[PDB]
């Protein structure tokens, strides 16, 4: 583990300090369908012509990123992704830019989001939820060892692969920080109290978000919901959680320690760090090595119909890609 993480960091740091740039070009890909949208572009299913490999290409309109003041966040995202390498993180295959846009070509993960299956089925059994929770526990131990805070855990951002294992996507808010940080970002249901209250905060916000996730998986709804974000915030800072009567007592206790307002008491945030979580009774049946190596059988394998099938994703209205004749925001994105 220590020795895993030592090698992981050496590996990461080389790429961190010398980021890969300009490793493909748009005209090498055949565009097929939109798998998702966002405030600065979309993710499209695409085909790499030279190989016949399918990928998910994220396109960001440089002008939109600038307007929304997300330049630094966007350079974080690319610089981190090109440098990390973990089984439960979607791989960045290529990245490039043109006059108008930024492009991040990711590994295509055809099983769709946990969100979809979670909403459809209603809720996951404790074993089913424990299985995905353990993959996140290891993923955060990997990312936090690298000084990386993730900051957007939610079922919408966890993709299910062909083996029924999770792949974390969307690094738009990930940041390499040694001390504390202040940006208000993330998703309302998943924000730790520190964030809402404009305190400086650190990685402990990822562990809190883990408690929100685990609870959502196992209850079928989040511990703090309302029709408007400000009503959600009050619920979160009051730190009053009710559990479904079906919740096992081990689960209720883990959740009490994860969704802990007092940072000297929050699991992940103490002298033993991540082992508080890994050693908790709820996880007693978890074989950590076998999860990492993917030899545990998944509770659920997605229905697969083809290499480039898209039915596990919602439909989205297409929009043509226009590339301007003039370079936009060149200086802002020169390191991209």
């Amino acid at each position: 583990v220590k020795e895993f993480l030592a090698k992981a960091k050496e590996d990461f740091l080389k790429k961190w300090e010398n980021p890969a740039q300009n490793t493909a070009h748009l005209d090498q890909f055949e565009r097929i369908k939109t798998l998702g949208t966002g405030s600065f572009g979309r993710v499209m299913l695409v085909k790499h012509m030279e190989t016949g490999n399918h990928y998910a290409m994220k396109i960001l309109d440089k002008q939109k990123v600038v307007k929304l003041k997300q330049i630094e966040h966007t350079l974080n995202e690319k610089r981190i992704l090109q440098a990390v390498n973990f089984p439960f993180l979607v791989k960045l295959e290529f990245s490039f830019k043109d006059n108008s846009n930024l492009y991040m070509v990711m590994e295509y993960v055809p099983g769709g989001e946990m969100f979809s299956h979670l909403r459809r089925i209603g809720r996951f059994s404790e074993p089913h939820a424990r299985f995905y929770a353990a993959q996140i526990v290891l993923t955060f131990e990997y990312l936090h060892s690298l000084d990386l805070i993730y900051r957007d855990l939610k079922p919408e951002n966890l993709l299910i692969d062909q083996q029924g294992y999770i792949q974390v996507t969307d690094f738009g808010f990930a940041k390499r920080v040694k001390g504390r940080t202040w940006t208000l970002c993330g998703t309302p249901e998943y924000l730790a109290p520190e964030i809402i209250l404009s305190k400086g905060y650190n990685k402990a916000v990822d562990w809190w978000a883990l408690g929100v996730l685990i609870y959502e998986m196992a209850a079928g709804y989040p511990p703090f919901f309302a029709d408007q974000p400000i009503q959600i915030y009050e619920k979160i800072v009051s730190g009053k959680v009710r559990f479904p009567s079906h919740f096992s007592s081990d689960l209720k206790d883990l959740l009490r320690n994860l969704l802990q307002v007092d940072l000297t008491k929050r699991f992940g945030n103490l002298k033993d760090g991540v082992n508080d979580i890994k050693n908790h009774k709820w996880f007693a049946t978890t074989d950590w090595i076998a999860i990492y190596q993917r030899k545990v059988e998944a509770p659920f394998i997605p229905k697969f119909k083809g290499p480039g099938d898209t039915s596990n994703f919602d439909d989205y209205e297409e929009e043509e890609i226009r590339v301007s004749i003039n370079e936009k925001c060149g200086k802002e994105f020169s390191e991209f």
Binding site: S39, L68, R119, F173, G186, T187, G220
Partner: peptide
């Protein structure tokens, strides 16, 4: 029920990130 209160709320679709 809490489930019923959830299902009837405006937040059962995909949830957008906030920032600033």
């Amino acid at each position: 029920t809490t489930y019923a209160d959830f299902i009837a709320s405006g937040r059962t679709g995909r949830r957008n990130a906030i920032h600033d």
